[PDB]
C-alpha cells in the first residue's frame, strides 16, 4: 500500500532540482563529520578506516606527524577553556588533526549553504512556504506558534528571503536557460567539466600535488628533503612496499593531470551538444521523467559496477592501503591482520552492492513506465525504436528462453565441477566409483631417499593381471626409495600416515618426477586421483593472462625452463649413482661407486642452486591480471576458472527476472493464453486458479531478481576475501595447495567455519552475527504461503485480549485489533529482511581481517 508511494514521478524540474541540491548539501554535512571522526584522538573504526588511505594519498593525513601544536592561525592554540576550538582542546592535536578539523568545518559550511539554497529552489517553486511547514514539528513546542507562521522563500521578499521571483525555471526570462532536458544535456556536462577543473586546481595549489609532467624535483619528507624518485610514497614516488619507483600515472600527481584531461573533454562534448543537441525521434519520449528515470538509474548502477572493477584492480596493491598495514590498527580492542586489503575489499564490495541494487531497481522503474503505457492504451502507439524493437511476443520468448538455456549450461558446468572436485577431495566411495584425492611425495633431494613398501603390478595393460610386493632376492619385502618409484605402484595409505580415506587401501603413483607448472621447485611422485588440475585451463583468462605475461618476461622464462631441464638431468644421473651404490654387493664395488657420486655431488649442488635462483627470479615478475599479495604473477587456478564460469552463469540467473519485467509486465505467454493482463504492477496473485498464481507481478519479479543475485554476490564476496570457490570442503593446509603455492582460507562450506574462528575473537562482531541471523529467518514468516493462517490466528488473539479487557476493566484493551500484514507488504518486508540479514553477516566475513598468505 501507499506509504512508500508518496512521491511518484513525473515531477516538475524545480522540485527535483531542489531536492537534489538539498541532498547534496546534506551529504557534504555528513562527510564533514566524517572528517572530524578521522582525528587521531579517536579509536579506529570502520568509518574512519574506509577514508584513511585516501586521505594519506591526498597529503591531508600524515602518518609520521608527531608534534603537538600551540599557535597556528591565531594566538590561542594549545588547549583553552570552553575548548578554544570547542570539544577539541582537550587532547593533543597535531597538524594532521588541524588539517582534518579544517576540511571538516569546510564541508559543514558548504553543506549548510547548499541545503539553504536548495530549499530556496524547492519551496520557492510553490511561492514560498512557512517556517512551521518546512520544519513541521515546530508548532508542537508551546509559546512559539507565532514564530512558526512566517513565510520564507517568497517570490517577493527582500534579498534574504527570496525563493524564485519568477516562479519557475520556465517563466524566468534569462535567455541562457535551456528549455528541455535534451537541451539541458549540454550545460550539465559543461558544468561537470568545470567541476573537474575545480578539483584539479585544488589538488595542484591547495594540496600541492602538481600534475604530470610538472611534478617537483624535490619534496619534503620526515627524513629531510629528498628527490622525488627516492622519496617514499606519501611524499614522493618511491613505493616502499614493492621496492620500485612508481609509474607517474600511478601517483596522485597522475590523478591531478587527469582532472585537466577529463575536464577539457567534458567541456568540449558539452559545447558540441550546445550546438547540435540530441534530437532523435527515438529520444523524444524521454522528456517525461518517469521514462528517463529508468535510463539514468540503470546507467548509474552500471557505473557503480565499473567503479568496483576499476577500483579493485587499480588499488589492490597500491601503497595507500598497504600503509594501513604498517600503522597499528586496533578495532574493538583487537589488532587486524592485513587491514589494507580489508578496507580495500569493503569499498569494492560496497560498490558492487550498489551496482546490483540500482540496475535491478532502474529496470523495475522502467517496467512501471511500460505498464502505464499498456494500461492507458499507448504502448501500441509508441514511436521510439527502443520500445518497438521489443514489442513482438515471439521474439520475447526467444530472448528469455535462450538466456535461460545459456544460464543452464554454464551453471551446470560450474556447479557440477564443484561437486565433482569436492567428491574427489573427500575420497567418497559411491559403490559405482571411488573418488580419489591428490597426494604428492617428493622424489628429489633428501626426501628421495626415504623407502616404502610397494605393491607393483605385473602388467597393467592386460586384465588377468596380478601384482606382487617388491621383494629381495631372498624373499623379504624390500623398501623402495621414493626416488625409484614408477607409475602404477601402490603404497599403503596407513604407511603414508593417511586416515581419512578409509574405503580404499593404496595410493597409486600416476606421474613421477612431476614439477608444477607454477609452484614449488621440487620433484614429486603423484596420485592425481579424481582431482581435476587441468580445469584451471578451461578459463579464457588463464590464457590471456599467461600469454601477455610470457611475452613480457620471455627471457627469464626461457632461462628458467632451461635451468629446470638441466636440474632434471642432473637429478636423474644422481639417482643412477645412488642406485649403483645401493646395489653394489662388493665392499670394493660399493666404495668405488661412492667415490663417483662424491665427485658428482658438486654440480648436482650447482644445478640445484641454479634452478632455485632462476625460479625465484621468475616468480618476481610483475602481474598482468592474476596477482599475488605483493604484485607478482601468479598462474590461474581452478578457483579463477570457476569464478569465470560462475560470473557468466550466475549473473544470467540473477538477471532473467529483469528481462521478464521488461517483456511481461502486462502479458506473458502464460497470461496471454488464458487472456489475462496484469492490472497493476504489484498485485500478489489472483488466487488459486490454474494451480496457483502467486508471484507474476513486476514488483515480485523485482524481489526474485534480488534474491537470485544474492548468489553471484556471495561468490564475489568469497573470492575477494580469499575463499576457495572451486570445491566445498577444501582446507588451506593440504598437499595440493602447498605444492602449488596456493593460499586460501576455505572451500565453500569450509570457509564459513574457518573465517568464523576469526569472527569469534571479537565481541562486537559476534553480536552483529547473532542479530543478523535473527533478521533473516523472520523473513520466512513473511514469504511463506501462510498469510491466511496468520490473519485467522491474529483474529483469535484480538478476541482474547478484548475479553480480558472487558473482564478486567481495561478500557484501552477492550478494542484492540492486531494488524496482520497483507500479501504485497509481506513480500516487500520479507525481502527487506532477507537481504539485510544476509548482508550484515557478509560484512562480518570482510571485517574479521584478510588472511590469505602474502
Amino acid at each position: 500500500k501507499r506509504w512508500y508511494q508518496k512521491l511518484e514521478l513525473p515531477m516538475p524540474p524545480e522540485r527535483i532540482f531542489g531536492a537534489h541540491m538539498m541532498l547534496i548539501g546534506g551529504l557534504a554535512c555528513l562527510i564533514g563529520t566524517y572528517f572530524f571522526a578521522s582525528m587521531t584522538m579517536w579509536n579506529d573504526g570502520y568509518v574512519n578506516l574506509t577514508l584513511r588511505p585516501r586521505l594519506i594519498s591526498l597529503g591531508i593525513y600524515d602518518p609520521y606527524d608527531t608534534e603537538q601544536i600551540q599557535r597556528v592561525w591565531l594566538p590561542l592554540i594549545g588547549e583553552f577553556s570552553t575548548s578554544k576550538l570547542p570539544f577539541f582542546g582537550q587532547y593533543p592535536l597535531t597538524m594532521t588533526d588541524f588539517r582534518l578539523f579544517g576540511w571538516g568545518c569546510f564541508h559543514i559550511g558548504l553543506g549548510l549553504w547548499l541545503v539553504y539554497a536548495g530549499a530556496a529552489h524547492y519551496y520557492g517553486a510553490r511561492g514560498g512556504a512557512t517556517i512551521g511547514e518546512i520544519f513541521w514539528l515546530l508548532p508542537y513546542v508551546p509559546g512559539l506558534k507565532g514564530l512558526c507562521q512566517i513565510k520564507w522563500f517568497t517570490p517577493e521578499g527582500p534579498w534574504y528571503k527570496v525563493g524564485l521571483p519568477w516562479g519557475s525555471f520556465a517563466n524566468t526570462p534569462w535567455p541562457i536557460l535551456r528549455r528541455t532536458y535534451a537541451d539541458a544535456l549540454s550545460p550539465h556536462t559543461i558544468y561537470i567539466g568545470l567541476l573537474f577543473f575545480i578539483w584539479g586546481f585544488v589538488l595542484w595549489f591547495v594540496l600541492d600535488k602538481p600534475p604530470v609532467p610538472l611534478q617537483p624535483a624535490q619534496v619534503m619528507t620526515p627524513n629531510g628533503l629528498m628527490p622525488l624518485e627516492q622519496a617514499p610514497f606519501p611524499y614522493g614516488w618511491f613505493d616502499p612496499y614493492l621496492n620500485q619507483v612508481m609509474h607517474p600515472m600511478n601517483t596522485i600527481n597522475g590523478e591531478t593531470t587527469m582532472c585537466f584531461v577529463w575536464g577539457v573533454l567534458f567541456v568540449a562534448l558539452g559545447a558540441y551538444w550546445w550546438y547540435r543537441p540530441p534530437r532523435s525521434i527515438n529520444i523524444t519520449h524521454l522528456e517525461d521523467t518517469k521514462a528517463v528515470f529508468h535510463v539514468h538509474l540503470t546507467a548509474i548502477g552500471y557505473v557503480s559496477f565499473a567503479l568496483a572493477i576499476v577500483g579493485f584492480l587499480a588499488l589492490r596493491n597500491h601503497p595507500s592501503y598497504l600503509m594501513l598495514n604498517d600503522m597499528n590498527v586496533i578495532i574493538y580492542g583487537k589488532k587486524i591482520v592485513n587491514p589494507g586489503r580489508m578496507i580495500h575489499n569493503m569499498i569494492t564490495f560496497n560498490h558492487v552492492q550498489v551496482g546490483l541494487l540500482y540496475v535491478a531497481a532502474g529496470v523495475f522503474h522502467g517496467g512501471q513506465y511500460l505498464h502505464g503505457l499498456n494500461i492507458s492504451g499507448a504502448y501500441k502507439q509508441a514511436r521510439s525504436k527502443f520500445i518497438t524493437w521489443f514489442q513482438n511476443p515471439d521474439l520475447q520468448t526467444k530472448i528469455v528462453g535462450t538466456t535461460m538455456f545459456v544460464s543452464f549450461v554454464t551453471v551446470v558446468f560450474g556447479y557440477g565441477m564443484i561437486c565433482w572436485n569436492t567428491g574427489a577431495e573427500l575420497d567418497l566411495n559411491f559403490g559405482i566409483y571411488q573418488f580419489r584425492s591428490f597426494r604428492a611425495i617428493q622424489m628429489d633431494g633428501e626426501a628421495g631417499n626415504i623407502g616404502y613398501r610397494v605393491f607393483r603390478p605385473k602388467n597393467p595393460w592386460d586384465p588377468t593381471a596380478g601384482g606382487d610386493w617388491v621383494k629381495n632376492p631372498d624373499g623379504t619385502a624390500k623398501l623402495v626409495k621414493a626416488r625409484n618409484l614408477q607409475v602404477g605402484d601402490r603404497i599403503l595409505n596407513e604407511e603414508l600416515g593417511i586416515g581419512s580415506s578409509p574405503t580404499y587401501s593404496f595410493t597409486t603413483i600416476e606421474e613421477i618426477n612431476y614439477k608444477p607448472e607454477w609452484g614449488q621447485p621440487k620433484l614429486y611422485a603423484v596420485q592425481w586421483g579424481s582431482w581435476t588440475h587441468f580445469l584451471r585451463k578451461v578459463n579464457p583468462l588463464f590464457w590471456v593472462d599467461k600469454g601477455i605475461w610470457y611475452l613480457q618476461n620471455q627471457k627469464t622464462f626461457e632461462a628458467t625452463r632451461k635451468a629446470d631441464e638441466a636440474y632434471l638431468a642432473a637429478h636423474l644421473k644422481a639417482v643412477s649413482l645412488l642406485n649403483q651404490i645401493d646395489d653394489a654387493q662388493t665392499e670394493e664395488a660399493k666404495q668405488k661407486a661412492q667415490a663417483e657420486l662424491d665427485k658428482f655431488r658438486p654440480e648436482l649442488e650447482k644445478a640445484h642452486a641454479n634452478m632455485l635462483e632462476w625460479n625465484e627470479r621468475l616468480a618476481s615478475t610483475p602481474a598482468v591480471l592474476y596477482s599475488n599479495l605483493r604484485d607478482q604473477h601468479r598462474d590461474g587456478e581452478i578457483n579463477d576458472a570457476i569464478f569465470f564460469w560462475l560470473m557468466i552463469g550466475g549473473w544470467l540467473f540473477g538477471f532473467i527476472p529483469l528481462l521478464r519485467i521488461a517483456f511481461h509486465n502486462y502479458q506473458s505467454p502464460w497470461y496471454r493464453d488464458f487472456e489475462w493482463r496484469k492490472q497493476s504492477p504489484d498485485f500478489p496473485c489472483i488466487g488459486p486458479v490454474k494451480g496457483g498464481t502467486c508471484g507474476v507481478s513486476i514488483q515480485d519479479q523485482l524481489w526474485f531478481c534480488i534474491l537470485f543475485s544474492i548468489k553471484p554476490l556471495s561468490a564475489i564476496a568469497w573470492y575477494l576475501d580469499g575463499g576457495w570457490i572451486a570445491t566445498m570442503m577444501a582446507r588451506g593446509n593440504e598437499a595440493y595447495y602447498l605444492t602449488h603455492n596456493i593460499s586460501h582460507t576455505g572451500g565453500v562450506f569450509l570457509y564459513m567455519w574457518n573465517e568464523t574462528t576469526w569472527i569469534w575473537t571479537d565481541n562486537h562482531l559476534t553480536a552483529m552475527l547473532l542479530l543478523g541471523h535473527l533478521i533473516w529467518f523472520v523473513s520466512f514468516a513473511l514469504w511463506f504461503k501462510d498469510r491466511g493462517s496468520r490473519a485467522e490466528g491474529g483474529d483469535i488473539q484480538s478476541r482474547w485480549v478484548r475479553l480480558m479487557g472487558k473482564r478486567l476493566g481495561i478500557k484501552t484493551l477492550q478494542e484492540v485489533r492486531f494488524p496482520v500484514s497483507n500479501l504485497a507488504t509481506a513480500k516487500l518486508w520479507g525481502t527487506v529482511f532477507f537481504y539485510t540479514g544476509t548482508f550484515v553477516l557478509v560484512f562480518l566475513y570482510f571485517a574479521d581481517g584478510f588472511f590469505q598468505n602474502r
Binding site: N43, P222, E616, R731, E734
Partner: protein, 193 residues
Amino acid sequence: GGCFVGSRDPNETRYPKAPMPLQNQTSTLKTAAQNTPGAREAAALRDRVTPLNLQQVNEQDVAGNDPLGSPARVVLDEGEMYRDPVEIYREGRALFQNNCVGCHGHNGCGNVPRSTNFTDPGWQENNSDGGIYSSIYNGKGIGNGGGAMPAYYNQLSPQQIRYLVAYLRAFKGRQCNGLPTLSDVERMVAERQ
C-alpha cells in the same frame, strides 16, 4: 553503528613500523626515528607495542615450504627463543588473540570440546617446545588439513610458530581470566623459560 568509537589509548601509537620485506625470508637469491619534536618517543613506543610478524607471510615463507621449517629440521635455540619478553609478548599475544582464541577460549583454558587448556601444569610439564611445534605444524587428530586441532604448515611461518611456542608457556598456572600479560611473560622467562 559508526563514529562513536572511543578515544584511542595513548599507549597504542600509530607511529609507523617499517614495511614487511618483499624478498622471501627463505630467499637464496640474496638471503633472508628522527629528532622532530616527538618522533623518538613514538619510535620507542612502537618498538614495544606494535607487532612486526602478525601479517600472513609470503607463500614461499610458510613452514611447509621453508627448507628448515619441518618439525625434524627447525632450530629451537632457547637463547634466541626466550631472549626478550617484550618481544614474546608483543608477538605471541597478537598471533594468539587472532588465531587461537576461537577454539581455546578468551582465557586460553579450552573452548572447543577436548581442546587444549594451556594453564594446566600437567600439560606444560609433559610437552617439549619441539613437541608443541610438531602439533602446530601437523595438527592433531585424523582429518583433511589436520584434525580437530588444525595443521598450520601452509598458514604460519617457523618464526611465527616459535613466538607462539614461547607465549604458550606463559599460560602455566594462571587463573581463567584472559590472556598472559607482559609480566606473566616476564616471570616465565625469569624462571627459565
